[PDB]
Amino acid sequence: MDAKARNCLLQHREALEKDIKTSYIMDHMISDGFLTISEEEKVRNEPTQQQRAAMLIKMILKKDNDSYVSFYNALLHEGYKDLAALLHDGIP
Ligand SMILES: [Zn+2]
Ligand SMILES: [Zn+2]
Ligand SMILES: [Zn+2]
Ligand SMILES: [Zn+2]
Ligand SMILES: [Zn+2]
């Protein structure tokens, strides 16, 4: 993804990981088409909520612009408008 978007995720990494429950966000991104079911299972396998969110963010950091926007939209739609507001200015 564009550096602007990546740097924004890094800036806000700790809050994102602190706060996010992954299950609904991930099904949103899978329905959208920008997270695979194999990626989802890797996240789901982690044994705590912080560790699942850490895995998800780790994955997203390696994806493209279209995936950043899908993640952003999932935050907007699945109960994290606060976190979406932090990532808005980083949209590719
Ligand atoms: Zn799923
Ligand atoms: Zn959704
Ligand atoms: Zn969507
Ligand atoms: Zn497995
Ligand atoms: Zn972390």
UniProtKB/Swiss-Prot annotation:
Source species, domain of life? Eukaryota
The residue ranges of the CARD domain are 1-90
> What start and end residues bound the annotated signal peptide?
none
Q: What induces it?
A: By E2F and p53/TP53 in apoptotic neurons. Translation is inhibited by HNRPA1, which binds to the IRES of APAF1 mRNAs.
Q: In which tissues is it expressed?
A: Ubiquitous. Highest levels of expression in adult spleen and peripheral blood leukocytes, and in fetal brain, kidney and lung. Isoform 1 is expressed in heart, kidney and liver.
Where it sits in the cell: the answer is: Cytoplasm
Instruction: Look up the further comments and give them.
Output: Physiological concentrations of calcium ions negatively affect the assembly of apoptosome by inhibiting nucleotide exchange in the monomeric form.
Subunit field text? Monomer. Oligomerizes to a heptameric ring, known as the apoptosome, upon binding of cytochrome c and dATP. Oligomeric Apaf-1 and pro-caspase-9 bind to each other via their respective NH2-terminal CARD domains and consecutively mature caspase-9 is released from the complex. Pro-caspase-3 is recruited into the Apaf-1-pro-caspase-9 complex via interaction with pro-caspase-9. Interacts with APIP. Interacts (via CARD and NACHT domains) with NAIP/BIRC1 (via NACHT domain). Interacts with CIAO2A.
About its domains, the entry says:
The CARD domain mediates interaction with APIP.
Query: What is the documented function of this protein?
Result: Oligomeric Apaf-1 mediates the cytochrome c-dependent autocatalytic activation of pro-caspase-9 (Apaf-3), leading to the activation of caspase-3 and apoptosis. This activation requires ATP. Isoform 6 is less effective in inducing apoptosis.
Name recorded for this polypeptide: Apoptotic protease-activating factor 1
Q: Which organism is it from?
A: Homo sapiens
